[PDB]
Every structure is written in structure tokens, then in C-alpha cells.
């Protein structure tokens, strides 16, 4: 069960509230992990931790013992030349079209011959979805089509680690669930690793094989779904079936009305 | 990675986007050499299927002879799992 | 009382800005560029110069047409008439087509080097370029930096030549003065080497100075689209007090 | 059942795709309506006519009578003056704070006097989820918040008719359970009107009471939700479990690639 | 053929908008702003005006330094160093103050009159407020049109009162000039209702088509953070091409 | 709308921002000769509570003595559902 990022314990505040408190992970290789939770952690601000973008504070993150932020700037770009990212509402690179979108970071990364580096060009969009709206302007898009653009390019080089950051957001019931076969159909035939961060808890029980439920700085509950929801707290029972029963700011203010002057 | 000889050219081992061009032209000097083409590329050799296991084997035949001409056995049990991600039929030998 | 240590302090997040804009400078100079910067540094030069290039000519015809139609009206009193090709170069030359060059430079292409990279700021362009794994530093800037070097002092020679010779087009062909006195008043005035050569070399460092923080200011900036116009001016601020506040300096280093 | 919209009929191209031809949709006053369908259609491109943002072709959309785009724009302000609109992802007015951008609408219209405009202006944010976050920039939020800050100045003034356009897109499953109670109980207390966009089949039925899922450029399906699941064309069951059986571009080109040079 | 009747095509279409900006102006102006607008347009100035005073003062205080530092050291030769005080009035006032002025006003805010309209139409910050219901034409235009209008001649009476203030200070404290005869030199020759009354209707027109082009660039460009930038040197193009353009038809109608 | 006398101030049929300015400062002119304040307001004439039934009321007592001295009968049946969307308790008279 060896890993490839393994979270030594974390403290990290930027927006000096409680986030991430002496919390430790372990994403082993060949797993679809889903890191589900409610709006009290920052926003693939994990993600970012991983991707060596902000800081961690006292924390300390082993990519195989290879430190990100202790490593270079030269040795970080070919690390991060190891994954593939689905931004949050996915960033496109505006005015390139779909036909240089995906591949741009094939173009990054050529090592081959003129034609294999043409071929595979050719081989990506008819691999993912794709082949006949290849110059089409990045302008007449939707959220259904964004993320739907985004993830060609994902997936673009085969990774040894690849990020998806709620893909299902703007996807048709049907897509949604072409797409919930798209991502697990690369991963047993291709056994790369996989990290999802959604909150849609029917299909993720279904896809995932460790999800990890965080509420403001630490872990709700970890595992696989069968004893995840067989062991769970009061706080992953109200996270389940939806019921409304939790310690949220519904209101913020909860003092009076009736002493309470209005400006 | 290496194709051999005895009439036959194999994909063994991995596909790995470093090579496929010193093995893509000496692997089409045999081709001209083999009429008819009765060689067999045998593919469950293969096990690294990924989109670049696409690429080199159909590159012979774009300027080779007959398009069913030169054959193929089989995907090595994750290849397949591509087809359908690609909606795919019949396209290559399944021998 | 803590707006004068708000107003306090705000030198030193600016000195301390400043230093990392140098310590972003070495660090995109002392690396070798790979295969295909050239090609992207071409397309510069087709977005920064020849872009530029239909502004400097206007501007050009302009002020050489003011300068030799006032001064000689007073000038000509006296006796003469003759000087009017000197002063005309002599102004030009080592004195508005270093200043007024780059004036006219850090408006066009001095935004448009900020504003394409406020471009890829706010959409998480720059961000997703890491994350793919390229270096902008690289990628995006080193190209575009290269291009601001190169393009200015290829425009303001550019803009004075034709800045001279608007200046004719008033005196020959209205003010019917003698065009063997024209230009012989400049082949005796106007050395080469000591003129047109050290207008170039004014025009380099007010070409650095205006690229380098126009490149800088539109990276290390928050993506917030109002304070895309407040680093929008910084640049031209921090240009024009430098264009011209190192005018002074090699003016006199130079003669004097 | 006397409407508010009543769209006649209408063609529409700003892809040159097919988008919108003779259709004709009615808006029952006081009724939770939900525009959602597959990827075809313009996102809220729909709901741009009614705001009367882009133009009706052959269309015709009448506001009881007074004709949007045969109006002055003197008595369109004072139209789009009914409306309130949380946008696809969200827009927040960035400079101004939270205080602010609820706020903004309620400055923009007040009619009472200055005490009583204040009163107001300290008594929305109570009547929301809030007045305990009311100076943090919108520099400091993500979708589960973007939505929630934005669909506050939606409800700030008390409209005629109201729109949301996938609120349901970064919320988690507690919360998102408050919202489907936050919209609807709205609802029912001030008799208003509401036209929700979204695609999320389980709580989209048991919130709405008319339906319409529209396919490229016709409804596939209208009604109450008894009847509309009763009445599934085969265009329907196929939508409502996301049964992988559909004729959408699942992928585009189906050309050979034997057959097919790689550039 | 081909790019020729595509170039052919672009002009049409150019022609086209441009007429519409005209068409915008009157709807701008021919309504009357209600409660509320002056406290933005207030804020405008402290927008554009109040921010825009710290670079005119050191373009002001230099080309001042330069002028009387050149022409006078060919001058003095014959018998004229009192006509010092002259040839540094006359060719700011009604010269380069009109130009000069407008060409530092359209690169500081002559952009963030268009980045911060072009901030709105990338978000849909422009859409979301016609949707809630304002009008941005009256509610983020004509306070920054009214501003736009107003601060140009507010800055460039006060840029040509230190350039003439600025060739003071090369003159008596390093040339040793008299001082009586630099001030008298002007007195007799300069006088107000011709010079610098007329140095402000330059500097109107000069204020309406640089701020006008501005706000229109801004408003009606496609949300494009590419060509947000190719917007922005039109908005600079144009008023470059056109603050030039038309002194010449301002220095004929006043004198000539 | 309209508040009445027979020592009750009452508020029937509509709240609706083009008023509650004459009916406030007139309608307190009742309160301060309205002594240890046993007046009773009927809300449930109210029939359009929409968080501006939520302002002049409260209004009173700013500019009043008595906190909970001045009564209120109860909600009309659509007001309460505003209630517990603010999360709140017990906060006015509920006769
Ligand atoms: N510049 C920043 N970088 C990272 N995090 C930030 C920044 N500014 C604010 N934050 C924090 O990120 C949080 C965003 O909320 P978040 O937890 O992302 O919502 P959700 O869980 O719905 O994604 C805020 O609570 C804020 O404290
Ligand atoms: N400027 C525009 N205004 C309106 N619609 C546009 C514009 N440009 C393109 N479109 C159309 O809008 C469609 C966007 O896809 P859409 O149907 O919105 O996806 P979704 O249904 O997932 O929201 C495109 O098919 C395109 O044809
Ligand atoms: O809007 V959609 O986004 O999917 O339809
Ligand atoms: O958690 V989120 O809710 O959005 O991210």
C-alpha cells in the first residue's frame, strides 16, 4: 500500500480562521481517493498545498522523500511536470481554440519524431471525446462545456498522478454519467492515480476507494465506503443522507432583534 | 519495445514517447520486404496501451498496402477498455 | 493618527516590491533560452513594434513641423535663416527623441505588455501555465522582454528621421528658405559620433527601464480588475519619472 | 392560471446551430418553474430574452402585454426593475464589500426616508443567513460562497418574478438542503415568482410545478411532475436516471482511423 | 483581392462603430443626472484627476530645464538673452501645453478609463448591472465622462505653471539671468486673452476626444483579455491621431 | 395601512415602502400619550409581511420606554415562515 504524497502534519492559516491543524495524508497509488467535505476548507487550497503553490506553514510534505520546497525551481517544473489539473471553473487558455488548448502541453513536452509528435496531436481528440470541435473559439462555451474542455487536456499526457477539481458541476444527468465511467475507465486500464475533490455523495461512494470527509482543520472520517459510513461520527451521519442537523452558521448573528438598532 | 525477426514484427514490452521512430522506419524496412504482408504483430506483447500504442502500428500502413493486408491478434485485456472510450467497433485484427 | 504610518510604510512594501523585481531581472537574463523563442519572439516584435509603428511616424511629422515654424519667425530677424536646420536636428537629436520616444512608447506597448499579462492573472492563465508545469518566466515574459529591448531603439531613430524631415517639408516647400544652407547648416553642427550614436545609447536604458517594470507590474500583480488599472498606471508613473529622471543624469555624463 | 411571461413563438441562432425554433413557453404566477434539460440549449440564453439582453429573431416575448425591444428604455429600467438574477458564477460587484454588494440594489432603489432606508439596510442581511460577515472583501470566497453572497442582493428587493441560475453548483449536501427550504419557503410566504435553471433531477421535482426540459430546440417534456415522469417520451427516461442511452456527441468524429492520416 | 477586400471590410465596420459612439455621446449627456451622481463624479476626480497631479509636475519641471537651456546658448551670440524669458512662454503656451498635457493624460487615464470598463465586461460586471436594473450609461459612464472633461484643463494650466516655473531655475540660479528681464520679457509679449485664454480652448477639445474615445473603447469591446489590449491602443491610437490632428486646425483658426 | 384609535394601533392590509414614514411619526404620537403602553397591535390585518412589516413596528420602541411593554397578537399565517429562515425564537408578543 506505498503512496506516492504523503502529508506530514499540516498548520496553515491564510485567511486566519482554523484551517488544516495538524492533519497527515497518505494517497496510495492506484486508488480513486475523493477528498469530500463541507464549505469549512479551503477551496482545493489542499490541492494547492500538493502542487507546492502556497505555503505550508509548519507543515511538510514528502513527495517520496523529494520535499516540494526544498527542491528546486528547475527540479519543480519537471515534478510539475507530472500531473494534470481540471481547474475549479476550468481556465481555459482564452483566444487559443479547443484544437490548441488540448494540445498545448502535448506541444510542451514533445520527445518524439515531427510525425509522432503530429500523430499523437491527431490520436488525443479522438481519445477523449473529441475530433470535430477542433476550432471552435473558447468564447461560445458553457459550464457543461468548460470543465467537458477542460478535462481533454487533463488527461492530455498520461500522468503518474492527475487531479480532478469537481468536474461534475455543469454536466446533464446523462454526460455526468458518461463522465463517471470516463474517469474510472482510464484509471484501471492505465493504473495512474487519481484525486477527486466534489461533493456529489451518490456517484463518489461508488468511484472512490479512500474518501476523506474534513470539516474545518481535520479529518470527519477516512477509508474505504464500507466502513465509512459503518463508522460514522455525528458529523458524517448528518453529511450522508442530508439531514439538517449540524453545527453551521445558518445565521451568523444570534443576538437580538428587538434591541437591536438599525444604523 | 524491440521487433523482431522470423517474418514477424512484435511490440514488446512498453510504448514510451522516447522511441517508436528508430523502431518505426527499421521496423517498415522489413515491410517492404514482406509482400503480401502475412506478418502478424502480435500485440498482447504490448502492456502499456496508451493512445501512443495508437500511433506507430497504423503509421507503417499509411503509405503500406492493402488496409487489412497486415494483421494484428489482440489487445493485451486494457486496450480494449480504450475502444469503447472511443465508441469503437471492429477496427484492427482480433485474432 | 495611523494614516501617516498607512502613509507610513508604504515606501517600504514598494522598496520591498522593488527589490523583487530585480531579483526577478537576473533570473530571467542568466538562462539560456531553449528552440522555439525565437519563433515567439518574432510575434513579439509583430506585436510590440510593428504594431507600434504607425504612431511614431504621425507624432513624428508633427513636432518638426512646430519646431522650424516658430522659431525661425523670431530668428530670422536678426540674420538668419540658415541655422534653422541646425537647431531643428540638434533638439531633436540629443534631447525629445529619447524623452519623447518612450513617452509615446510606455503609452502603446508599455499598457499592452501590463494588460496581457493582467490578462493572464485573473483567469488563472498564469496560474494553470505552472500547474502544467512551463515557467512564464521562460514562457511568457523572456520573449516579451526581449522584444521591448529591441523595438525602441528601432522605432526612435525611426521617429526622428522622419522627424527631420517633416521639418523640411514646412521650410522648402512654404517658407521658401535654401536647401543648400538647409542641410549644410547640420553636416557642419551635427557630428555622428557624438550625436546619433549617443542618442542611442540615452534610447537603450529608457528602452529597459520602460519594458522591464511594464513586464513586471502586470506579473506581480493582485488579479482584481480595478487594481489591474492602479498597477495600469504604476507602470507609466514609475516610467515617466524614471525616463525622465535619468534623461538628467546622461545628459550629463554625456556633455556639460 | 393566469401568466406573467408569455413567450410566443420564437427562433433563435447565435451559434448557427439549432437553438430555439417555434417554441412557446407560459410562466403561471406563483409557481416554482425549472429550465433545465441536456447541454443543448444557451445557457440562461433563454433567460438573456426574457431579460431582453439578446434579441428575439422571429420571436415574440410578451410582458402582459407590453412588448420587451417595443418598450422604451426608459420603461425597460423601470422593467428590469422587477427582477431579481443570480448570474451562472455569480457576479459579484469585486470592489465593494459584502456589505456592499447586497447593499447595491437597495441603495439603487430607495423610496422611504433615510432612517427607514437604513432600517432596511441592517434588517435584509438578518432576513438572509448573515450580518456576521459583512466587511470581508470578495476576494475571500469560493462557488459554495460566491452563490450564497450573490443570491442575497437576488431576494433584496421583493420582486414580481425572480430567477436563479444554478445555485445548487458548489453547495454541500446540509446546506444545499437548506437552500431547496430557502428558496421554497420564500416562495409560499410572498407569492412571488420563481424560474430555476439547473440540472439536479431529485430535488428539482420535489420543488417545482412545472417542468421543461428542452433537448436543442423544442420541449421534450412539460407539466407537473406526476404527469411528466407518467408521460416519458423516450427522450425523458433516458434523462431521468442518465440511462447511457442517448443520441448526444458522445464522440464527434466517426470517421475511421485505418483510413485516417494523423497531419 | 483576397486581404484587400478583407482590409476594405475592417474600415467599413470601423466607420460604422465609430458613428455609433456618436450616438452614444448624445444619449450620455441629454439627460439629467440624478441625487447620488456627484458623489461619484466626485470620487472620479479623486479617480482621475487628484492621481494623475504627481507625474505632470516632473514632466512640467523638465522640459522647462531643457528649452531654456539649448536655444539660449546659440541666442546669446548675437545679442538676446532677454528674449529668454519669451521663446519658453510662447511655445508652451500655446504649443506644447495643449499637446504635451494630452499625451501623459491619455496614458495614465486615458487607460483606466477603459481597463476598469474593460474590468467590467470580462466578469459580466456590465451585464449583472443591467440585469438588476441601472443604467451603466448613466451610472458608470457620465461620472467618468464628467470627470474626464473637467480634470484636463484643471492640469495642464497647472503643468505649464511649473514649466515655466522650471526654465526659472536653470536661468537665474545656474545661468545667471536677470531677473527683470526674463519677467518683462514675457510681460510685453505674452498677452492673456490671446495666449492662455487660448491655450484653454485647445486644451477642451483636446480633453472631450481623449476621454470620450476612452470610455466608448471600453464599453463596447468583446470581453477578450487578448483584445482588451488591442482595445487599448485604440483608444490611444485614436487620440493621438486626433489630439494631433486637430491643433492644426486650432492653430490656424486663432492666428495665421 | 392605516393605524386606528380606540387606544389600538393597528396595521391592516399592506406595508409597501411608499409609507409607514406619516403612519410612523403619527402613529407614535398615540404612543407617548399611550401611558405603561397596553396597546395591543393585531398583526395578523397585516396580511403582506415582507421584513418591511419587520421595521416601523420595532420602530416605535426605539423612540418608546418599555421593552416588552408594548403587545403584539400574532403572525398572519405566512410571516412566521420568515421566522425560522432568520433561525428565531420567541422574539415579539405571540397573543
Ligand atoms: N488568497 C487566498 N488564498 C487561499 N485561501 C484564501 C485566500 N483568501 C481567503 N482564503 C480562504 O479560503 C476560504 C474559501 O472558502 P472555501 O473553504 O474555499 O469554500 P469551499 O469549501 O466552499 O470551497 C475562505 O474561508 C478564506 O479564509
Ligand atoms: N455570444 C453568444 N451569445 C449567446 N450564445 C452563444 C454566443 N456564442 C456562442 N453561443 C452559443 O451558446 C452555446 C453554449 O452552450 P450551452 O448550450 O450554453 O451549454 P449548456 O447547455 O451546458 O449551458 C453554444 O452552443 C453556442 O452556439
Ligand atoms: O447548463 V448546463 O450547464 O449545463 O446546462
Ligand atoms: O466546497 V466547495 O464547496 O465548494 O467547495
Same mark, same amino acid.
Given at each position: 500500500t506505498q503512496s506516492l504524497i504523503e502529508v506530514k502534519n499540516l498548520s496553515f492559516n491564510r485567511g486566519e480562521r482554523?484551517?488544516?491543524?495538524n492533519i497527515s495524508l497518505n494517497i496510495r497509488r492506484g486508488q480513486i481517493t475523493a477528498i469530500m467535505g463541507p464549505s469549512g476548507t479551503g477551496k482545493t487550497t489542499l490541492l494547492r498545498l500538493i502542487g507546492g503553490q502556497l505555503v505550508p506553514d509548519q507543515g511538510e510534505v514528502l513527495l517520496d522523500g523529494k520535499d516540494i520546497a526544498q527542491m528546486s525551481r528547475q527540479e519543480l517544473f519537471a515534478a510539475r511536470a507530472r500531473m494534470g489539473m481540471l481547474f475549479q471553473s476550468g481556465a481555459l487558455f482564452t483566444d487559443m481554440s479547443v484544437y490548441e488548448n488540448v494540445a498545448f502541453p502535448i506541444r510542451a513536452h514533445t520527445k518524439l519524431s515531427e510525425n509522432l509528435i503530429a500523430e499523437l496531436v491527431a490520436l488525443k481528440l479522438e481519445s477523449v471525446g473529441?475530433?470535430?470541435?477542433?476550432?471552435?473559439?473558447?468564447?461560445?462555451?458553457?459550464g457543461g462545456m468548460n470543465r467537458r474542455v477542460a478535462l481533454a487536456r487533463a488527461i492530455a499526457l498520461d500522468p503518474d498522478l492527475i487531479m480532478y477539481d469537481?468536474?461534475?458541476?455543469?454536466?446533464?444527468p446523462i454526460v455526468k454519467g458518461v463522465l463517471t465511467r470516463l474517469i474510472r475507465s482510464l484509471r484501471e486500464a492505465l493504473d495512474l492515480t487519481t484525486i477527486i475533490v466534489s461533493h456529489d455523495v451518490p456517484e463518489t461512494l461508488s468511484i472512490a476507494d479512500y474518501i476523506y470527509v474534513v470539516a474545518?482543520?481535520?479529518?470527519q472520517g477516512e477509508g474505504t465506503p464500507e466502513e465509512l459510513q459503518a463508522y460514522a461520527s455525528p458529523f458524517v451521519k448528518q453529511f450522508?443522507?442530508?439531514?439538517?442537523?449540524?453545527?453551521?452558521?445558518?445565521?451568523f448573528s444570534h443576538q437580538a432583534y428587538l434591541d437591536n438598532e438599525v444604523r | 519495445v524491440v521487433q523482431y525477426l522470423n517474418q514477424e514484427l512484435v511490440v514488446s514490452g512498453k510504448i514510451d514517447?522516447? #522511441?517508436?521512430e528508430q523502431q518505426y522506419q527499421a521496423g517498415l524496412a522489413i515491410i517492404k520486404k514482406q509482400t503480401s504482408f502475412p506478418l502478424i504483430v502480435?500485440?498482447?506483447?504490448?502492456?502499456?496501451? #496508451?493512445?501512443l500504442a495508437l500511433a506507430v502500428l497504423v503509421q507503417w500502413l499509411?503509405?503500406?498496402?492493402?488496409?487489412?493486408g497486415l494483421h494484428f491478434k489482440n489487445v493485451p485485456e486494457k486496450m480494449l477498455k480504450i475502444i469503447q472510450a472511443c465508441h469503437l467497433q471492429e477496427d484492427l485484427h482480433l485474432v | 493618527m495611523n494614516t501617516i504610518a498607512w502613509?507610513?510604510?508604504?515606501v517600504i512594501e514598494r522598496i520591498r516590491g522593488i527589490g523583487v523585481a530585480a531579483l526577478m531581472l537576473l533570473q530571467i537574463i542568466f538562462s539560456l533560452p531553449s528552440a522555439g523563442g525565437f519563433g515567439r519572439f518574432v510575434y513579439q516584435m509583430h506585436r510590440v513594434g510593428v504594431m507600434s509603428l504607425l504612431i511614431i511616424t504621425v507624432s513624428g511629422l508633427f513636432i518638426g513641423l512646430v519646431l522650424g515654424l516658430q522659431g525661425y519667425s523670431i530668428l530670422v530677424?536678426?540674420?538668419?535663416?540658415?541655422?534653422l536646420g541646425t537647431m531643428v536636428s540638434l533638439t531633436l537629436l540629443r534631447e525629445l527623441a529619447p524623452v519623447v520616444a518612450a513617452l509615446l512608447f510606455a503609452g502603446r506597448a508599455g499598457s499592452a505588455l501590463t494588460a496581457e499579462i493582467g490578462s493572464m492573472k485573473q483567469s488563472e492563465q498564469l496560474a494553470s501555465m505552472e500547474m502544467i508545469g512551463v515557467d512564464p518566466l521562460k514562457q511568457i515574459v523572456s520573449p516579451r522582454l526581449w522584444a521591448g529591448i529591441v523595438s525602441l531603439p528601432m522605432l526612435t531613430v525611426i521617429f526622428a528621421a522622419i522627424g527631420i524631415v517633416g521639418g523640411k517639408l514646412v521650410g522648402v516647400?512654404?517658407?521658401?528658405?535654401?536647401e543648400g544652407s538647409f542641410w549644410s547648416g547640420m553636416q557642419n553642427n551635427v557630428q555622428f559620433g557624438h550625436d546619433v550614436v549617443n542618442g542611442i545609447i540615452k534610447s537603450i536604458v529608457f528602452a529597459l527601464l520602460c519594458t522591464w517594470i511594464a513586464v513586471f507590474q502586470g506579473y506581480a500583480c493582485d488579479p482584481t480588475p480595478e487594481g489591474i488599472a492602479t498597477a495600469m498606471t504604476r507602470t507609466v508613473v514609475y516610467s515617466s519619472l524614471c525616463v525622465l529622471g535619468f534623461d538628467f543624469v546622461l545628459t550629463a555624463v554625456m556633455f556639460g
Open positions: 482554523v484551517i488544516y491543524d473529441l475530433r470535430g470541435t477542433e476550432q471552435l473559439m473558447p468564447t461560445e462555451l458553457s469537481e468536474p461534475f458541476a455543469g454536466q446533464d474545518e482543520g481535520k479529518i450522508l443522507t442530508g439531514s439538517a442537523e449540524g453545527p453551521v452558521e445558518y445565521q | 514517447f522516447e #522511441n517508436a502480435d500485440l498482447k506483447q504490448l502492456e502499456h496501451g #496508451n493512445t499509411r503509405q503500406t498496402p492493402q488496409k487489412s | 502613509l507610513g510604510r508604504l530677424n536678426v540674420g538668419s535663416e540658415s541655422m516647400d512654404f517658407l521658401g528658405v535654401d
